[PDB]
Amino acid sequence: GDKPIWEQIGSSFIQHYYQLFDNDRTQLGAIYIDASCLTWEGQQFQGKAAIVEKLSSLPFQKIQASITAQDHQPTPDSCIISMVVGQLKADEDPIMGFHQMFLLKNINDAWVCTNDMFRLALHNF
Amino acid sequence: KPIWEQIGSSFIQHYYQLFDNDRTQLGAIYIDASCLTWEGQQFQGKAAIVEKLSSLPFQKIQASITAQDHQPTPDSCIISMVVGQLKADEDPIMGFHQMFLLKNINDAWVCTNDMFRLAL
Numbered sequence A: 001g002d003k004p005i006w007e008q009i010g011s012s013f014i015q016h017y018y019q020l021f022d023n024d025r026t027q028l029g030a031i032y033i034d035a036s037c038l039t040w041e042g043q044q045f046q047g048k049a050a051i052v053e054k055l056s057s058l059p060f061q062k063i064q065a066s067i068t069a070q071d072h073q074p075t076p077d078s079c080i081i082s083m084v085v086g087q088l089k090a091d092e093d094p095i096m097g098f099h100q101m102f103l104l105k106n107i108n109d110a111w112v113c114t115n116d117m118f119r120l121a122l123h124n125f
Numbered sequence B: 001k002p003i004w005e006q007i008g009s010s011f012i013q014h015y016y017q018l019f020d021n022d023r024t025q026l027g028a029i030y031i032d033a034s035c036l037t038w039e040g041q042q043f044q045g046k047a048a049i050v051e052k053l054s055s056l057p058f059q060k061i062q063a064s065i066t067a068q069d070h071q072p073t074p075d076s077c078i079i080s081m082v083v084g085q086l087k088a089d090e091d092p093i094m095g096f097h098q099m100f101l102l103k104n105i106n107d108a109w110v111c112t113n114d115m116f117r118l119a120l
Helices: A005-023 A048-056 B003-020 B046-054
Strands: A032-040 A043-046 A063-074 A080-090 A096-106 A111-120 B030-038 B041-044 B061-072 B077-088 B094-105 B108-118
Touching: A005 A063, A005 A080, A005 A096, A005 A111, A032 A048, A032 B061, A043 A048, A063 B030, A063 B108, A080 B094, A080 B108, A096 B077, A096 B094, A111 B061, A111 B077, B003 B061, B003 B077, B003 B094, B003 B108, B030 B046, B041 B046
Parallel strands: A032 A111, B030 B108
Antiparallel strands: A032 A043, A063 A080, A080 A096, A096 A111, B030 B041, B061 B077, B077 B094, B094 B108
């Protein structure tokens, strides 16, 4: 009947996450729960409070994320797993490539993110 | 090293050894209902996955992993995410991103979900 439900939920989750992330990241605690984990550039952060503190303490003033590709699959436990490849433009930094993964689980009519992994692509010099 | 990094690191070592040497042996780490998204195309089920990876058009391929990040999920799975570089035959080196969702099924870790993309 056209687009599978994990494609519609994943894609709208990605679009909402990056709108929040580009504009106000203290509002990012709404998509995460107490058991969520975040791995940002190799460092692991357990729990909502440590996740939000970490994303609020980034040194960028202005950030613009652009998605180059997004791939969404259902998992066997009924979760949605998404892989994002994109580009970041922060302040006057040079444009960086990134990869990001999100694991989504339906808890009380809302799809929340239990697991989030982020890593910047390094330029080979 | 935490327990999910030990399992993830071993899975990745196993996957890339088979991928670089004999890709018809890659159905060993997948189950029947695994799903693969390779460069935006979806390959469903073990038989479609192994066909696709066995039929890639190169003879010799070497991957190197640049970064590898591993997490446990609340439902007993591991998420493994990799950034690397590939050298296939005599083509130029290509960058890649790969993601694996591992689940413990019948006492062994298997891949259920696999997503691959080339860095353009």
